[PDB]
């Protein structure tokens, strides 16, 4: 009877091996990357239709009636939704049935339907974008017993045990003799663990699919992969297939073989319809429902994830992937990204067919006007398969998009340079070392009859000759100092006269930072993709704080933005001002010699949007001016709902009237211009002639 001692002592070693993994770190859970968290408040400038696209972009479903969470219904002037549960960083939250009611172009109320009482603010769960690739290649999403519906548990138990045996198989075993080992270790833990815990570990471990060279396993990550919704919100027809795929994940895959995978769902629906849980009253409904996502996803948002990945080890260090169950909260906006991706996908072939181009590429970057939080990033014409990210990697000449920096430097000197100061416009010839004389020309190759133009109009019209006359009067290091204050790389600045008209090679995310500093009213906000990084135990690892650094005077930035509103209404960008006049959009056009690169920096009330349009091989685009990059921005403005830019003038701003000769008038005048003054009595000094 010595065999009874060998098996008894062996069981203690199996019990020690189970206790070590289960009581502690079970799996190396990858880091979940979520999008932005949108709070909703009374009198918020959001429409009903704008809220519908926000909800659908955050994985909500428009339905006739609401049953499970992540669902909503539209009415004449209101939306009724069930806000899904989400463990937010500030406070954990359950399901919330609420009605968002609209007056016109604003959210009037948000009322909880269970108590018929308003909310001061209402949180919206962030969209799960992707999971950060693990070394082992076992991608999962942990969900405790509480998160799984009881019908999904009944559908599982009905087709497997019907009171665990395959849990121990996938835990520590591999691929007849060790079936006794599987039977012994199953009964050891089943007796020494809870009835609820065995379903939790099983539902997160089971293999349900593949996504390239990484194993997608567990009901939670599989639900979002196969259906685009969490495990909690699975319809019984979707639960039947997800339960059915446990036996043959690869053979019952809907992408490789849809016909074979369709029969499994109906077979599992019969196993439960034959038993008590379901009857034949609804078999015809669930058997008709076909399976939704089209061809899964290997790498969602590759462009935006480059910035997230770069920023993670640059802030927290590479000592972070070792941690399990990390929660990364990004600034990503799904409405803007979806709007930008369509504008790039549809806008590129629209230009190639009209102008007869063989190839044309693009890059769009949207950031917050005041905080610099990166809201969207498109780095190519077709973001279906995107290896190269033009928004970060493609470093190109900014061209005429460099002109605002010269006028900013000038307008920061209120006592000498203003919006009515005259700049010369006659032939120029600047000698330089090595070697020929530099004779810059306007696009027109024309000069003004009077031999001068006032500052305001030179920027409005993007006049080359007066920008060189202004830029050289201030000095090249004064203009270069503004580029450093605007937040561009110092290694890219070469202070020579060519720099004044665009000899400066920046990438769209570096241009985004420059225009952001202006957009805020001269406050440089270091561009960021991360909001916070939280551990599995709720402890914060990284948390953003405001970094608004006073770069240039607020009055100088205001007048430069006021002039950029004239650029879009009557100047180089007059095309967009006629389409969207009610936004009062501020912006600037970008063109290089032979139009190798085209750009547009568009600022609205809420964001800064930089757009580049050029070829990868640095060749002439055969496109008129900045119309190439403006038409992509027009499509982005069309694809989502922009915010009107209603500029609030800072202190010491006085709207003064000037005569035809460009001098301030006491009473009246024929052209009103904002001017940086504490005492607007400059008119006395001008009128006493």
């Amino acid at each position: 009877i010595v065999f009874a001692v060998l098996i008894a002592i062996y069981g203690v070693y199996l019990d020690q091996k189970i206790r070590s993994r289960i009581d502690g770190k079970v799996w190396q859970l990858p880091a979940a990357v979520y999008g932005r968290m949108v709070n909703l408040e009374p009198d918020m400038t959001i429409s009903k239709n704008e809220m519908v696209k926000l909800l659908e972009a955050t994985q909500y479903r428009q339905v006739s009636k609401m049953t499970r969470p992540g669902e909503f219904t539209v009415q004449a002037n209101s939306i009724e939704m069930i806000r899904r549960p989400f463990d937010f960083p500030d406070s954990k939250e359950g399901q919330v049935r609420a009605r968002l009611t609209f007056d016109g172009d604003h959210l009037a109320t948000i009322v909880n339907m269970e108590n018929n009482r308003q909310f001061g603010f209402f949180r919206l769960d962030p969209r799960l974008i992707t999971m950060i690739s693990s070394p082992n290649g076992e991608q999962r999403l942990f969900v405790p017993r509480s998160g799984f519906p009881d019908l999904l548990v009944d559908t599982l138990l009905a087709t497997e045990d019907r009171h665990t045996q395959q849990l121990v198989k996938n835990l520590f075993l591999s691929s007849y003799w060790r079936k006794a080992n599987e039977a012994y270790m199953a009964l050891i833990m089943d007796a020494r663990y809870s009835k609820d815990r065995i379903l939790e570990l099983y539902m997160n471990e089971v293999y349900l699919g593949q996504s390239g060279d990484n194993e997608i396993r567990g009901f939670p990550l599989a639900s979002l992969y196969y259906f685009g919704r969490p495990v909690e919100e699975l319809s019984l027809d979707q639960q039947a297939l997800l339960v059915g795929m446990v036996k043959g994940a690869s053979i019952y895959n809907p992408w490789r073989n849809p016909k074979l995978a369709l029969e499994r769902r109906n077979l599992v629906l019969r196993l439960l319809q034959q038993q008590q849980i379901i009857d034949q009253e609804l078999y015809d409904m669930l058997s008709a429902r076909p399976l939704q996502p089209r061809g899964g996803v290997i790498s969602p948002q590759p462009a935006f994830m480059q910035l997230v990945r770069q920023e993670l080890q640059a802030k927290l260090g590479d000592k972070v992937k070792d941690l399990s169950g990390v929660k990364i909260f990004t600034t990503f906006d799904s409405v803007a990204q979806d709007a930008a991706e369509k504008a790039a996908v549809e806008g590129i072939p629209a230009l190639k067919k009209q102008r007869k181009l063989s190839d044309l590429e693009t890059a769009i970057v949207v950031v917050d006007r005041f905080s610099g939080e990166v809201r969207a990033m498109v780095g190519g014409s077709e973001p279906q398969f995107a290896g190269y990210n033009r928004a970060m990697q493609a470093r190109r000449s900014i061209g005429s998009l460099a002109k605002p920096a010269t006028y900013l430097t000038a307008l920061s000197q209120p006592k000498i340079y203003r919006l009515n100061t005259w700049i010369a416009d006659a032939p120029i010839a600047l000698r330089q070392p090595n070697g020929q004389v530099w004779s810059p020309q306007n696009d027109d190759r024309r000069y003004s009859e009077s031999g001068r133009v006032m500052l305001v109009d030179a920027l409005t019209r993007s006049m080359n000759v007066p920008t060189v006359n202004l830029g050289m009067a201030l000095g090249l290091p004064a203009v270069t100092e503004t580029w450093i204050k605007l937040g561009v790389p110092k290694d890219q600045l070469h202070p020579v006269p060519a720099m004044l008209l665009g000899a400066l090679n920046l990438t769209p995310i570096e241009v985004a930072q420059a225009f952001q500093t202006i957009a805020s009213g001269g406050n440089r906000a270091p561009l960021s993709a991360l909001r916070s990084v939280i551990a599995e135990d709720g402890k914060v690892l990284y948390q953003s704080f405001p970094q608004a650094e006073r770069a240039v005077p607020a009055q100088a930035a205001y007048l430069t933005l006021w002039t950029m509103q004239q650029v879009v209404q009557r100047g180089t960008g007059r095309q967009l001002g006629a389409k969207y006049p009610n936004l009062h959009l501020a912006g600037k056009t970008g063109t290089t010699n032979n139009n190798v690169d085209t750009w547009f920096a568009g600022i609205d009330g809420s964001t800064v949007t930089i757009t580049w349009v050029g070829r990868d091989n640095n060749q002439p685009t055969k496109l008129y001016g900045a119309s190439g990059a403006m038409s992509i921005y027009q499509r982005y403005l069309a694809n989502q709902t922009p915010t009107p830019l209603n500029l609030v003038p800072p202190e010491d701003i006085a709207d003064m009237g000037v005569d035809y000769d460009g001098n301030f008038v006491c009473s009246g005048g024929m052209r009103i211009l904002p001017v940086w003054t504490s005492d607007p009595q400059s008119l006395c000094q001008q009128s006493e002639m």
Partner: peptide, 13 residues
Amino acid sequence: PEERWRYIKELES
């Protein structure tokens, strides 16, 4: 029982 099947009709409709 009929209390399980009736709830499922209004949940899936």
